[PDB]
Subunit: 120 residues, 2 copies
């Protein structure tokens, strides 16, 4: 009954800090650091929501979004370390549900995760 | 067994003039004016190439690309009646194969359709 979140992020330090905060707030959270494994993992485990970094070893965020959408219908929240309008429009038009600039306050990330889960 | 083209254009007038020209030039051509109907028709009829307007009643051209690309792998030539900033990059990155601003001379459109069909 706890929402399952998958954090796809290559920055291990930030990913674990975020995972611990979300677990303390009633979420079941896993971490993936590779785009290729993230594609198979998202399709196989079917998490309730994905937090997806744009730049990853292997498949980048846009590729992950494109490859899972036909087999994964749950929300995708993208995170970026640099605010560029082009990448934000492409991420949303590719099928992402949100696109947030890093760094994001942990409580804001949780509020955005809860908002996305309300329409599933 | 001519190449099958689907023109997805809500401007019925231009669509029929283009259809007439392409049929006279050795192509089998159908016309669709609604984006939601274009998604179902592209996936079920599997045309050899789609000429896709970016602005349609129902699903927009970017939505048509996003929804057909998992099930349709033939060329998509996108058309726009008004160039907007970032429009070409988004369509090409979404899976379109070309992006042309109207008005396009009919002979130029035929040359572009033939060039795309050579990539198959
Ligand atoms: Ca990264
Ligand atoms: Ca990469
Ligand atoms: Ca139009
Ligand atoms: Ca529309
Ligand atoms: Cl994990």
């Amino acid at each position: 009954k706890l929402p399952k979140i998958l954090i796809v992020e290559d920055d291990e330090r930030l990913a674990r800090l975020t995972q611990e905060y979300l677990i303390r707030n009633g979420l079941e959270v896993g971490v993936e650091t590779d785009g290729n494994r993230a594609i198979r993992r998202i399709i196989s485990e079917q998490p309730d929501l994905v937090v997806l970094d744009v730049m990853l070893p292997g498949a980048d965020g846009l590729t992950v979004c494109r490859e899972v959408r036909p087999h994964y219908h749950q929300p995708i929240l993208m995170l970026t370390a640099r605010t560029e309008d082009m990448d934000q429009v492409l991420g949303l038009e590719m099928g992402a549900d949100d696109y947030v600039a890093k760094p994001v306050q942990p409580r804001v990330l949780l509020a955005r995760i809860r908002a996305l889960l309300r329409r599933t």
